[PDB]
């Protein structure tokens, strides 16, 4: 039973022997095996009672379970609580992940599961390499377990060992004659993971075994990967592979100097020029077979610079800080192209620094370029749109003018990215549909924040028309949140979440200017949510009718004049007069109610429960539906 299964879970949690023996006897054969072979739902995550014994290092309680019973380790359970918590793993998988060698070897001796295959086909050696204990890894392979188990995205145990700091596991894995040229889904062949965390000792271990250098899918060599992460120690190690050439050597120093210019952890402006000058000195060292810089066309986002083709012009920007950051950004774009994952993150960091220094227009240019680059890569950029909303609200709260074309461009990017978010939600059924839904709601909220910022700025006629066109485009795709809230409902709702950053100062919902803008652009004023509440049903429930009566009055006028029914009912059959919950909101609505005989007759039909099906026009059967 479930109640008695919790009794044996608590006894095995404390690692007690005499308590579990009395709690797993004096019953039939059928129920006892179910007690030791079924997971327990604790804390929202199911877990076998043998898991909590191995997680706390209680080998004594599980040793006698194997002696007195025939319990197996093949029970399906979760993987680990460090942000994964996906099921399918066996009971032996978490034994290696708990960092306990004494419990691993006892479960192997009775029904070893060294070749377990979950949905990620992760053997218990995968968690052993993640834990980083040599005794567990050495013993498990000795139990006739293959070390070439590749996942769906080719997650070799040497890759996760190279990514982690456990240098003992990776050196043992290569001692068993393992394949170093293991291709991945993204092409990251071992050394890409090794030269990403700045592990000087791990990278040298594969160098002795000649792991070789191969270009991955994103066009990045392991030397370029090391230079991207500002790890200069492993960059110098990868420059002595005896096959490096001149073309791939200066660009490594250029990438390293570019990466050091713009990073959170490793921000050294003195290292930026030194690596760039050394790269330029190595370029212009002989005068014959010279390797000139293939200069990209100038980009307005990075000012008006045209890279640095001479050592003299690199010297003139030594003491000027903001030019060096801009110079590092352009060469980083050239080396990694316009499709890298991390090509725009330093742009975001430099924009954040500029915003912290109240340099706003250059920040807007840089962040717009980053948004364009990320939308070319077709990734989730809801955080970028939230950052645009935050910086725009900061500029408005600081009494600074906002460029209307920048607002229009970020609104267009928001509309397109909401289109791709709707496509992602429709495509994904149950893979990451919760994350997709949350991102969709956040995207709608960020669009509302941008519309509020647009309302609180002065714009030209053409810019206002283009902003209205973007809003029109988003309205005529019918966006809806989880609880049926359209784009109008959230701008009318007082419970619409506002971001905890500077958006709280400028983005206040309900907003009379946003709702008037949405209704002017053509929002469906009579649209309903999942609960049946229209836009009028949500404004009447507003709990501050007198503090900001300007907001409440100037939006009921807008909603009624747009053509909302002041009479229609929700799924609970509650008129906004009955759902007014406020003396003020009732008086404002009754002033605006233009009565019709169609509404009174439909209300009388609905109140008397008259069967109206197959007795009225089809266009009218909807009218009785809400009246």
């Amino acid at each position: 039973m479930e109640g008695l299964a919790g009794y044996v879970y608590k006894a095995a949690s404390e690692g007690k022997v005499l308590t579990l023996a009395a709690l797993l006897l004096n019953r039939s054969e059928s129920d006892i095996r179910y007690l030791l072979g079924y997971v327990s739902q604790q804390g929202g995550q199911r877990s076998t009672p043998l898991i909590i014994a191995a997680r706390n290092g209680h080998a004594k309680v599980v040793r006698l379970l194997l002696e007195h019973y025939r319990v197996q380790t093949q029970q399906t359970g979760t993987v680990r609580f460090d942000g994964y918590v996906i099921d399918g793993a066996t009971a032996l998988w978490c034994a290696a992940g708990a960092g306990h060698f004494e419990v691993v070897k006892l479960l192997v001796s009775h029904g070893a599961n060294v070749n377990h295959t979950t949905v990620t086909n992760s053997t218990p050696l995968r968690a052993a390499c993640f834990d980083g204990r040599l005794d567990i890894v050495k013993y498990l392979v000795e139990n006739n377990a293959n070390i070439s188990i590749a996942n769906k995205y080719d997650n070799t145990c040497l890759m996760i060992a190279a990514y982690k700091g456990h240098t003992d596991v990776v050196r043992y894995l290569l001692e068993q004659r393992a394949d170093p040229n293991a291709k991945a889904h993204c092409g990251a062949t071992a050394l890409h993971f090794a030269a990403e965390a700045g592990h000087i000792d791990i990278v040298k271990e594969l160098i002795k075994w000649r792991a070789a250098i191969v270009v991955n899918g994103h066009g990045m060599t392991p030397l370029k990967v090391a230079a991207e992460s500002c790890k200069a120690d492993v960059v110098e190690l990868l420059l002595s592979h005896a096959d490096c050439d001149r073309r791939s050597r200066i660009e490594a120093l250029e990438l390293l100097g570019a990466s050091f210019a713009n990073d959170r952890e490793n921000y050294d402006i003195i290292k930026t020029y030194h690596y760039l000058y050394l790269a330029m000195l190595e370029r212009f060292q002989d005068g014959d077979n010279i390797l000139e810089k293939e200069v990209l066309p100038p980009i307005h986002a990075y000012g008006n610079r045209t890279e640095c083709r001479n050592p003299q012009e690199l010297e003139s920007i030594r003491q000027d800080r903001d030019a060096l950051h801009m110079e590092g950004l352009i060469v980083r774009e050239r080396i990694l192209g316009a499709d890298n994952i991390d090509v725009s993150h330093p742009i975001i960091y430099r924009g954040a620094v500029y915003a912290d220094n109240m340099e706003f227009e250059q920040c807007i240019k840089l962040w717009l370029h980053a948004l364009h680059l990320r939308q070319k890569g077709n990734r989730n950029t809801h955080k970028d749109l939230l950052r645009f909303a935050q910086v725009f609200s900061q500029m408005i709260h600081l009494n600074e003018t906002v460029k209307a074309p920048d607002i229009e461009c970020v609104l267009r990017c928001s509309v397109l990215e909401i289109e791709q978010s709707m496509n992602r939600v429709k495509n994904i059924s149950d893979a990451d549909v919760h994350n997709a839904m949350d991102n969709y709601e956040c995207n709608l909220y960020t669009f509302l924040y941008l519309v509020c910022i647009s309302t609180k700025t002065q714009c030209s006629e053409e810019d206002q028309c283009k902003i209205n066109k973007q809003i029109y485009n988003l309205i005529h795709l019918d966006p809806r949140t989880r609880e049926g809230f359209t784009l109008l409902h959230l701008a009318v709702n007082s419970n619409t979440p506002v971001d905890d950053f500077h958006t709280n100062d400028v983005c206040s919902f309900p907003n009379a200017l946003v709702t008037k803008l949405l209704l002017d652009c053509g929002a469906e004023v009579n649209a309903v949510d999942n609960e049946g509440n229209s836009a009028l049903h949500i404004i009447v429930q507003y709990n501050r009718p007198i503090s900001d009566f300007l907001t409440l009055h100037s939006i009921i006028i807008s909603l009624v004049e747009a053509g909302a029914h002041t009479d229609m009912t929700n799924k609970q059959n509650k008129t906004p007069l009955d759902k007014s919950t406020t003396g003020v909101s009732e008086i404002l609505l009754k002033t605006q109610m233009k009565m019709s005989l169609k509404c009174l007759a439909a209300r009388a039909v609905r109140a008397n429960d008259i069967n109206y099906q197959d007795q009225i026009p089809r266009t009218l059967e909807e009218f009785v539906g809400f009246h």
């Binding site: 019709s596 005989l597 007759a601 009225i616 026009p617 009218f623």
Partner: protein, 96 residues
């Protein structure tokens, strides 16, 4: 000046012009080739809808012309259960 509202049963329901023009298709019927510029009948034919619904429509006409700005508490218009779903389609047809 006065609109002669006839019904299917032949009952005249003569109401004022302003009271009749609150409806939509009453204004539509009075317009078109139906001016009759001698302001004595302005007959509009309802060969399809009964006379009790016309009675309720005319009382609603007087109601709407009277109760259009009188404070906020607009009184209750009484609808019998047996006549509704016929006044509903009549008010839809009249755009009332």
């Amino acid at each position: 000046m006065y609109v002669k509202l006839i019904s299917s049963d032949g009952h005249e329901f003569i109401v004022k012009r302003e009271h009749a023009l609150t409806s939509g298709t009453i204004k539509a019927m009075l317009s078109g080739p139906g001016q009759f510029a001698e302001n004595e009948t302005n007959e509009v034919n309802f060969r399809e809808i009964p006379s009790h619904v016309l009675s309720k429509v005319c009382m609603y006409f007087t109601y709407k012309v009277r109760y259009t700005n009188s404070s906020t508490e607009i009184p209750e218009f009484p609808i019998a259960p047996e006549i509704a779903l016929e006044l509903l389609m009549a008010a839809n047809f009249l755009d009332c």
